Design an enzyme around this catalytic site. Structure first.
Site, PDB file in Angstrom:
ATOM      1  N   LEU A  56       0.820  -1.208   0.000  1.00  0.00           N
ATOM      2  CA  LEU A  56       0.000   0.000   0.000  1.00  0.00           C
ATOM      3  C   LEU A  56       0.848   1.249   0.000  1.00  0.00           C
ATOM      4  O   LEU A  56       0.475   2.269  -0.568  1.00  0.00           O
ATOM      5  CB  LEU A  56      -0.920  -0.005   1.213  1.00  0.00           C
ATOM      6  CG  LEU A  56      -1.938  -1.150   1.178  1.00  0.00           C
ATOM      7  CD1 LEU A  56      -2.847  -1.139   2.399  1.00  0.00           C
ATOM      8  CD2 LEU A  56      -2.745  -1.136  -0.120  1.00  0.00           C
ATOM      9  N   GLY A  57       2.009   1.171   0.634  1.00  0.00           N
ATOM     10  CA  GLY A  57       2.849   2.340   0.751  1.00  0.00           C
ATOM     11  C   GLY A  57       4.269   1.991   1.111  1.00  0.00           C
ATOM     12  O   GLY A  57       4.590   0.838   1.419  1.00  0.00           O
ATOM     13  N   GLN A  58       5.116   3.011   1.087  1.00  0.00           N
ATOM     14  CA  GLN A  58       6.534   2.836   1.307  1.00  0.00           C
ATOM     15  C   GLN A  58       7.066   3.864   2.287  1.00  0.00           C
ATOM     16  O   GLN A  58       6.348   4.762   2.734  1.00  0.00           O
ATOM     17  CB  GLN A  58       7.287   2.964  -0.028  1.00  0.00           C
ATOM     18  CG  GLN A  58       7.941   1.698  -0.618  1.00  0.00           C
ATOM     19  CD  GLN A  58       9.025   1.082   0.260  1.00  0.00           C
ATOM     20  OE1 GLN A  58       9.343   1.588   1.338  1.00  0.00           O
ATOM     21  NE2 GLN A  58       9.627   0.000  -0.225  1.00  0.00           N
ATOM     22  N   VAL A 106       3.868  -0.667   4.188  1.00  0.00           N
ATOM     23  CA  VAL A 106       2.512  -0.906   4.632  1.00  0.00           C
ATOM     24  C   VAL A 106       1.826  -1.793   3.604  1.00  0.00           C
ATOM     25  O   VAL A 106       1.830  -1.485   2.419  1.00  0.00           O
ATOM     26  CB  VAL A 106       1.719   0.396   4.812  1.00  0.00           C
ATOM     27  CG1 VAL A 106       0.265   0.078   5.122  1.00  0.00           C
ATOM     28  CG2 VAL A 106       2.333   1.246   5.917  1.00  0.00           C
ATOM     29  N   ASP A 130       0.147  15.157  16.149  1.00  0.00           N
ATOM     30  CA  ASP A 130       0.373  15.139  14.701  1.00  0.00           C
ATOM     31  C   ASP A 130      -0.948  14.967  13.956  1.00  0.00           C
ATOM     32  O   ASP A 130      -1.030  14.199  13.007  1.00  0.00           O
ATOM     33  CB  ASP A 130       1.367  14.019  14.319  1.00  0.00           C
ATOM     34  CG  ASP A 130       2.021  14.254  12.966  1.00  0.00           C
ATOM     35  OD1 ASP A 130       1.820  15.346  12.382  1.00  0.00           O
ATOM     36  OD2 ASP A 130       2.722  13.341  12.481  1.00  0.00           O
TER      37      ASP A 130
HETATM   38  N1  LIG Z   1      -4.830   0.843   8.564  1.00  0.00           N
HETATM   39  C1  LIG Z   1      -4.653   1.113   7.144  1.00  0.00           C
HETATM   40  N2  LIG Z   1      -5.532   0.643   6.248  1.00  0.00           N
HETATM   41  C2  LIG Z   1      -5.378   0.905   4.936  1.00  0.00           C
HETATM   42  N3  LIG Z   1      -4.361   1.634   4.427  1.00  0.00           N
HETATM   43  C3  LIG Z   1      -3.430   2.137   5.256  1.00  0.00           C
HETATM   44  C4  LIG Z   1      -3.572   1.864   6.697  1.00  0.00           C
HETATM   45  N4  LIG Z   1      -2.368   2.569   7.317  1.00  0.00           N
HETATM   46  C5  LIG Z   1      -1.698   3.132   6.256  1.00  0.00           C
HETATM   47  N5  LIG Z   1      -2.353   2.838   5.197  1.00  0.00           N
HETATM   48  C6  LIG Z   1      -1.897   3.280   3.953  1.00  0.00           C
HETATM   49  O1  LIG Z   1      -0.386   3.229   3.877  1.00  0.00           O
HETATM   50  C7  LIG Z   1       0.036   4.634   3.557  1.00  0.00           C
HETATM   51  C8  LIG Z   1       1.207   5.051   4.398  1.00  0.00           C
HETATM   52  O2  LIG Z   1       1.030   4.610   5.759  1.00  0.00           O
HETATM   53  P1  LIG Z   1       1.527   5.522   7.004  1.00  0.00           P
HETATM   54  O3  LIG Z   1       1.180   4.890   8.295  1.00  0.00           O
HETATM   55  O4  LIG Z   1       0.752   6.775   7.092  1.00  0.00           O
HETATM   56  C9  LIG Z   1       3.319   5.847   6.908  1.00  0.00           C
HETATM   57 CL1  LIG Z   1       4.179   4.355   7.098  1.00  0.00          CL
HETATM   58  P2  LIG Z   1       3.803   7.007   8.233  1.00  0.00           P
HETATM   59  O5  LIG Z   1       3.700   6.443   9.594  1.00  0.00           O
HETATM   60  O6  LIG Z   1       3.009   8.252   8.280  1.00  0.00           O
HETATM   61  O7  LIG Z   1       5.207   7.489   8.135  1.00  0.00           O
HETATM   62  C10 LIG Z   1      -1.126   5.506   3.816  1.00  0.00           C
HETATM   63  O8  LIG Z   1      -1.180   6.596   2.849  1.00  0.00           O
HETATM   64  C11 LIG Z   1      -2.313   4.667   3.712  1.00  0.00           C
HETATM   65  O9  LIG Z   1      -2.874   4.778   2.363  1.00  0.00           O
END
Ligand SMILES: Nc1ncnc2c1ncn2[C@@H]1O[C@H](COP(=O)(O)[C@H](Cl)P(=O)(O)O)[C@@H](O)[C@H]1O
Ligand SMILES: [Mg+2]
Length: 265
Positions: A17-19, A25, A130
Protein backbone atom coordinates in the site's frame (compact mmCIF):
# COMPACT_ATOMS: atom_id res chain seq x y z
CA UNK A 1 5.02 -11.64 25.79
CA UNK A 2 1.36 -10.54 25.89
CA UNK A 3 -1.90 -11.63 24.25
CA UNK A 4 -1.33 -9.29 21.29
CA UNK A 5 1.29 -11.66 19.81
CA UNK A 6 0.42 -13.80 16.79
CA UNK A 7 2.24 -16.54 14.83
CA UNK A 8 4.01 -15.33 11.69
CA UNK A 9 2.35 -17.93 9.44
CA UNK A 10 -1.16 -16.59 10.30
CA UNK A 11 -0.30 -13.39 8.47
CA UNK A 12 -0.35 -13.01 4.69
CA UNK A 13 0.86 -9.87 2.95
CA UNK A 14 -0.96 -9.49 -0.36
CA UNK A 15 -0.88 -5.99 -1.81
CA UNK A 16 1.65 -3.31 -0.87
CA UNK A 17 0.00 0.00 0.00
CA UNK A 18 2.85 2.34 0.75
CA UNK A 19 6.53 2.84 1.31
CA UNK A 20 9.08 4.65 3.42
CA UNK A 21 12.69 4.58 4.56
CA UNK A 22 11.64 2.85 7.77
CA UNK A 23 9.10 0.30 6.60
CA UNK A 24 6.28 -0.80 4.32
CA UNK A 25 2.51 -0.91 4.63
CA UNK A 26 0.60 -3.86 3.17
CA UNK A 27 -2.99 -4.97 2.72
CA UNK A 28 -3.26 -8.55 3.92
CA UNK A 29 -5.10 -11.39 5.59
CA UNK A 30 -4.95 -12.51 9.23
CA UNK A 31 -5.85 -16.13 10.15
CA UNK A 32 -6.93 -16.64 6.52
CA UNK A 33 -10.26 -14.90 7.18
CA UNK A 34 -9.67 -11.29 8.36
CA UNK A 35 -8.66 -8.45 6.04
CA UNK A 36 -6.03 -6.30 7.68
CA UNK A 37 -3.43 -3.60 7.31
CA UNK A 38 0.10 -4.72 8.03
CA UNK A 39 2.93 -2.33 8.94
CA UNK A 40 6.53 -3.62 8.73
CA UNK A 41 9.81 -2.28 10.08
CA UNK A 42 12.95 -2.61 8.03
CA UNK A 43 15.87 -4.16 9.98
CA UNK A 44 18.41 -1.77 11.51
CA UNK A 45 17.06 1.40 9.89
CA UNK A 46 15.37 2.41 13.13
CA UNK A 47 15.39 1.19 16.72
CA UNK A 48 12.90 -1.66 17.34
CA UNK A 49 11.65 0.00 20.52
CA UNK A 50 11.22 3.30 18.69
CA UNK A 51 9.11 1.48 16.09
CA UNK A 52 7.05 -0.32 18.74
CA UNK A 53 6.26 3.00 20.45
CA UNK A 54 3.10 3.49 18.39
CA UNK A 55 1.84 -0.02 19.15
CA UNK A 56 2.22 0.49 22.90
CA UNK A 57 -0.10 3.52 22.84
CA UNK A 58 -2.61 1.71 20.61
CA UNK A 59 -2.80 -1.06 23.21
CA UNK A 60 -4.26 1.47 25.66
CA UNK A 61 -6.72 3.25 23.32
CA UNK A 62 -9.95 1.68 22.02
CA UNK A 63 -12.64 3.72 20.30
CA UNK A 64 -14.79 3.40 17.20
CA UNK A 65 -13.15 6.47 15.64
CA UNK A 66 -9.51 5.45 16.23
CA UNK A 67 -7.80 2.86 13.99
CA UNK A 68 -7.80 -0.34 16.01
CA UNK A 69 -4.72 -2.48 16.74
CA UNK A 70 -5.37 -6.18 16.07
CA UNK A 71 -2.04 -7.93 16.62
CA UNK A 72 1.71 -7.64 16.83
CA UNK A 73 4.81 -9.64 16.00
CA UNK A 74 7.22 -7.94 18.39
CA UNK A 75 10.63 -9.52 17.62
CA UNK A 76 12.53 -8.66 14.42
CA UNK A 77 11.27 -8.73 11.81
CA UNK A 78 8.48 -6.73 13.43
CA UNK A 79 4.92 -6.54 12.09
CA UNK A 80 2.03 -4.34 13.24
CA UNK A 81 -1.47 -5.50 12.41
CA UNK A 82 -4.40 -3.04 12.40
CA UNK A 83 -7.93 -2.77 11.02
CA UNK A 84 -7.98 -2.18 7.26
CA UNK A 85 -9.23 1.22 6.04
CA UNK A 86 -10.20 0.60 2.43
CA UNK A 87 -9.99 4.15 1.08
CA UNK A 88 -6.57 5.18 2.40
CA UNK A 89 -5.49 8.54 3.84
CA UNK A 90 -8.03 11.36 4.06
CA UNK A 91 -5.50 13.62 2.31
CA UNK A 92 -5.26 11.33 -0.71
CA UNK A 93 -9.05 10.87 -0.62
CA UNK A 94 -9.79 14.56 -0.72
CA UNK A 95 -7.25 15.17 -3.52
CA UNK A 96 -8.31 12.18 -5.68
CA UNK A 97 -11.26 11.29 -7.97
CA UNK A 98 -13.66 11.10 -5.01
CA UNK A 99 -12.91 14.65 -3.92
CA UNK A 100 -15.01 16.32 -6.54
CA UNK A 101 -18.25 14.84 -5.24
CA UNK A 102 -17.78 15.66 -1.57
CA UNK A 103 -19.89 18.64 -0.46
CA UNK A 104 -20.12 20.46 2.89
CA UNK A 105 -22.56 17.95 4.51
CA UNK A 106 -20.10 15.08 3.88
CA UNK A 107 -17.02 17.09 4.90
CA UNK A 108 -18.61 18.29 8.16
CA UNK A 109 -19.77 14.76 9.03
CA UNK A 110 -16.19 13.60 8.48
CA UNK A 111 -15.02 16.44 10.74
CA UNK A 112 -17.59 15.35 13.37
CA UNK A 113 -16.19 11.80 13.35
CA UNK A 114 -12.62 13.02 13.75
CA UNK A 115 -13.77 15.27 16.61
CA UNK A 116 -15.45 12.29 18.23
CA UNK A 117 -12.18 10.28 18.07
CA UNK A 118 -10.28 13.27 19.47
CA UNK A 119 -12.88 13.82 22.20
CA UNK A 120 -12.05 10.29 23.31
CA UNK A 121 -8.33 11.19 23.26
CA UNK A 122 -9.25 14.29 25.28
CA UNK A 123 -11.25 12.23 27.80
CA UNK A 124 -8.27 9.88 28.20
CA UNK A 125 -5.82 12.73 28.96
CA UNK A 126 -3.72 11.96 25.87
CA UNK A 127 -2.26 14.29 23.26
CA UNK A 128 -1.80 13.26 19.61
CA UNK A 129 0.69 15.93 18.42
CA UNK A 130 0.37 15.14 14.70
CA UNK A 131 -3.30 15.60 13.81
CA UNK A 132 -3.69 16.44 10.08
CA UNK A 133 -5.47 14.97 7.04
CA UNK A 134 -2.50 12.75 6.19
CA UNK A 135 -2.94 11.00 9.53
CA UNK A 136 -6.65 10.30 9.14
CA UNK A 137 -7.78 7.05 7.45
CA UNK A 138 -10.99 6.55 5.47
CA UNK A 139 -13.13 3.41 5.15
CA UNK A 140 -16.42 2.37 3.57
CA UNK A 141 -19.45 4.67 3.94
CA UNK A 142 -17.17 7.68 4.50
CA UNK A 143 -16.00 6.41 7.90
CA UNK A 144 -13.04 8.45 9.21
CA UNK A 145 -10.66 7.36 11.94
CA UNK A 146 -7.70 8.96 13.68
CA UNK A 147 -4.36 7.16 13.05
CA UNK A 148 -0.58 7.41 13.51
CA UNK A 149 -0.18 7.70 17.26
CA UNK A 150 3.61 7.39 16.90
CA UNK A 151 4.01 10.73 18.68
CA UNK A 152 0.99 10.45 21.02
CA UNK A 153 1.64 10.58 24.78
CA UNK A 154 0.22 11.33 28.22
CA UNK A 155 0.31 14.80 29.77
CA UNK A 156 7.08 19.04 13.60
CA UNK A 157 5.21 20.46 10.56
CA UNK A 158 4.84 24.13 11.48
CA UNK A 159 1.74 24.70 9.29
CA UNK A 160 -0.29 22.32 11.42
CA UNK A 161 1.36 22.96 14.80
CA UNK A 162 0.17 25.52 17.33
CA UNK A 163 2.69 28.33 17.91
CA UNK A 164 3.19 27.60 21.61
CA UNK A 165 3.97 23.95 20.76
CA UNK A 166 6.29 24.72 17.83
CA UNK A 167 8.21 27.48 19.65
CA UNK A 168 8.23 26.34 23.26
CA UNK A 169 7.38 22.62 23.15
CA UNK A 170 4.03 23.24 24.84
CA UNK A 171 2.01 20.26 23.44
CA UNK A 172 -1.45 19.84 25.02
CA UNK A 173 -4.91 18.71 23.91
CA UNK A 174 -5.36 22.43 23.06
CA UNK A 175 -2.50 22.34 20.54
CA UNK A 176 -4.33 19.35 18.98
CA UNK A 177 -7.43 21.62 18.86
CA UNK A 178 -5.31 24.13 16.87
CA UNK A 179 -4.27 21.35 14.43
CA UNK A 180 -7.95 20.37 14.07
CA UNK A 181 -8.69 23.92 12.89
CA UNK A 182 -6.07 23.50 10.19
CA UNK A 183 -7.62 20.10 9.35
CA UNK A 184 -10.92 21.88 8.80
CA UNK A 185 -9.28 24.05 6.08
CA UNK A 186 -7.88 20.88 4.44
CA UNK A 187 -11.39 19.40 4.41
CA UNK A 188 -12.94 22.52 2.92
CA UNK A 189 -10.24 23.07 0.26
CA UNK A 190 -10.20 19.42 -0.82
CA UNK A 191 -6.75 18.78 0.60
CA UNK A 192 -4.77 21.87 -0.36
CA UNK A 193 -1.65 22.65 1.68
CA UNK A 194 -2.50 25.35 4.24
CA UNK A 195 -1.06 28.91 3.95
CA UNK A 196 -0.71 28.69 0.15
CA UNK A 197 2.49 30.25 -1.24
CA UNK A 198 4.05 30.71 2.22
CA UNK A 199 7.13 28.86 3.31
CA UNK A 200 7.57 27.73 6.90
CA UNK A 201 9.49 30.81 8.10
CA UNK A 202 6.86 33.25 6.89
CA UNK A 203 4.18 31.07 8.48
CA UNK A 204 5.85 31.20 11.86
CA UNK A 205 6.42 34.94 11.54
CA UNK A 206 2.90 35.72 10.29
CA UNK A 207 0.93 33.58 12.77
CA UNK A 208 2.76 35.21 15.71
CA UNK A 209 1.92 38.61 14.19
CA UNK A 210 -1.79 37.61 14.25
CA UNK A 211 -2.31 36.32 10.71
CA UNK A 212 -4.94 33.62 10.27
CA UNK A 213 -6.09 31.92 7.04
CA UNK A 214 -9.17 33.58 5.51
CA UNK A 215 -12.52 31.90 4.89
CA UNK A 216 -12.11 29.34 2.05
CA UNK A 217 -14.28 29.96 -1.03
CA UNK A 218 -17.87 28.69 -0.58
CA UNK A 219 -17.18 27.88 3.08
CA UNK A 220 -19.86 29.37 5.40
CA UNK A 221 -18.53 32.10 7.63
CA UNK A 222 -19.85 30.21 10.68
CA UNK A 223 -17.53 27.27 9.93
CA UNK A 224 -14.59 29.65 9.41
CA UNK A 225 -15.48 31.21 12.77
CA UNK A 226 -15.08 27.74 14.31
CA UNK A 227 -11.58 27.56 12.75
CA UNK A 228 -10.66 30.93 14.31
CA UNK A 229 -11.69 29.69 17.76
CA UNK A 230 -9.35 26.73 17.31
CA UNK A 231 -6.68 29.28 16.38
CA UNK A 232 -6.97 31.56 19.39
CA UNK A 233 -3.54 32.69 20.53
CA UNK A 234 -4.46 31.72 24.09
CA UNK A 235 -4.61 27.88 24.18
CA UNK A 236 -6.99 27.89 27.14
CA UNK A 237 -9.56 29.90 25.09
CA UNK A 238 -9.83 27.28 22.36
CA UNK A 239 -12.89 25.03 22.44
CA UNK A 240 -12.83 21.42 23.66
CA UNK A 241 -13.16 18.51 21.29
CA UNK A 242 -16.35 17.70 23.19
CA UNK A 243 -17.72 21.11 22.12
CA UNK A 244 -16.39 20.67 18.56
CA UNK A 245 -18.02 17.27 18.19
CA UNK A 246 -21.45 18.57 19.29
CA UNK A 247 -21.20 21.68 17.13
CA UNK A 248 -20.30 19.72 14.02
CA UNK A 249 -22.91 16.96 14.60
CA UNK A 250 -25.70 19.54 14.92
CA UNK A 251 -24.30 21.95 12.30
CA UNK A 252 -26.97 21.84 9.62
CA UNK A 253 -29.89 22.29 12.03
CA UNK A 254 -28.51 24.61 14.71
CA UNK A 255 -25.93 26.73 12.84
CA UNK A 256 -26.61 26.65 9.07
CA UNK A 257 -30.28 25.68 8.66
CA UNK A 258 -30.39 27.59 5.35
CA UNK A 259 -27.36 25.90 3.76
CA UNK A 260 -27.72 25.30 0.02
CA UNK A 261 -25.33 23.23 -2.13
CA UNK A 262 -22.85 25.05 -4.36
CA UNK A 263 -20.38 24.07 -7.08
CA UNK A 264 -17.64 22.84 -4.74
CA UNK A 265 -19.07 22.96 -1.19
N1 LIG B 1 -4.83 0.84 8.56
C1 LIG B 1 -4.65 1.11 7.14
N2 LIG B 1 -5.53 0.64 6.25
C2 LIG B 1 -5.38 0.90 4.94
N3 LIG B 1 -4.36 1.63 4.43
C3 LIG B 1 -3.43 2.14 5.26
C4 LIG B 1 -3.57 1.86 6.70
N4 LIG B 1 -2.37 2.57 7.32
C5 LIG B 1 -1.70 3.13 6.26
N5 LIG B 1 -2.35 2.84 5.20
C6 LIG B 1 -1.90 3.28 3.95
O1 LIG B 1 -0.39 3.23 3.88
C7 LIG B 1 0.04 4.63 3.56
C8 LIG B 1 1.21 5.05 4.40
O2 LIG B 1 1.03 4.61 5.76
P1 LIG B 1 1.53 5.52 7.00
O3 LIG B 1 1.18 4.89 8.29
O4 LIG B 1 0.75 6.77 7.09
C9 LIG B 1 3.32 5.85 6.91
CL1 LIG B 1 4.18 4.36 7.10
P2 LIG B 1 3.80 7.01 8.23
O5 LIG B 1 3.70 6.44 9.59
O6 LIG B 1 3.01 8.25 8.28
O7 LIG B 1 5.21 7.49 8.14
C10 LIG B 1 -1.13 5.51 3.82
O8 LIG B 1 -1.18 6.60 2.85
C11 LIG B 1 -2.31 4.67 3.71
O9 LIG B 1 -2.87 4.78 2.36
MG1 LIG C 1 0.52 8.84 7.47
Amino acid sequence: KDAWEIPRESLRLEVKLGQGCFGEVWMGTWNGTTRVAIKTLKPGTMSPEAFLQEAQVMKKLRHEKLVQLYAVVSEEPIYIVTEYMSKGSLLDFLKGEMGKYLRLPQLVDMAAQIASGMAYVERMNYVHRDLRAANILVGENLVCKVADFGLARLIFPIKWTAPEAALYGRFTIKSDVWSFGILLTELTTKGRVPYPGMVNREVLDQVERGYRMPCPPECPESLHDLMCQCWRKDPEERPTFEYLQAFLEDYFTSTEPQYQPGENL
